[PDB]
Design a protein around this ligand. Structure first.
Ligand SMILES: [K+]
Ligand SMILES: [Mg+2]
Length: 97
RNA sequence: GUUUAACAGCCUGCCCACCCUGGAAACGACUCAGUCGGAGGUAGGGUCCAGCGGCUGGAAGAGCACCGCACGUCGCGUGGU
């Protein structure tokens, strides 16, 4: 399940939550996978997709809104998008492709 | 009774709004009340907006108060604080 893998990444991996940090990781090429929620504004989603295409980074469309993504990440706030800098014990980067 | 107009310049910069750095749970900030924050808070530094705000020019030469000299019939006279 995507949620279980995300929880495993949260408890054992490196990540950044938020649009600005996601763009920073994409610019720095440190991010390896970008997750975008349905709630994400269309323009922001398009910009993130363009950045990921430029950086050759996979993009996954989370099956939920920002509230659901934040809940899956274990946080009490909304998460519009997140970047997986390093999956510790998970294999999302390997399973998704 | 012990005053300072329009207008010109400089300064200031309410409550908001906005920008840059950064990335937050042991959640924090915060109002009389609320509310705000990974759609980026707290924090640090800035931009802008109001003013019937400040200083200067206008403008002390004016106005007001007080104290005097003089013509003493007609100087709307003359001086000081
Ligand atoms: K006027
Ligand atoms: Mg005088």
């Amino acid at each position: 399940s995507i949620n279980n893998r995300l929880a495993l990444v949260m408890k054992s991996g490196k990540y950044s939550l938020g649009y600005k940090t996601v763009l920073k990781t994409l610019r720095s090429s440190k991010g390896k996978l970008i997750l975008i929620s349905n709630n994400c504004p269309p323009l922001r989603k398009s910009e993130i997709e363009y950045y990921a295409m430029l950086a050759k980074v996979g993009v996954h469309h989370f099956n939920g809104n920002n509230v659901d993504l934040g809940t899956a990440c274990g946080k009490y706030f909304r998460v519009s998008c997140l970047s997986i800098i390093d999956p510790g014990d998970s294999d999302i980067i390997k399973s998704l492709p």
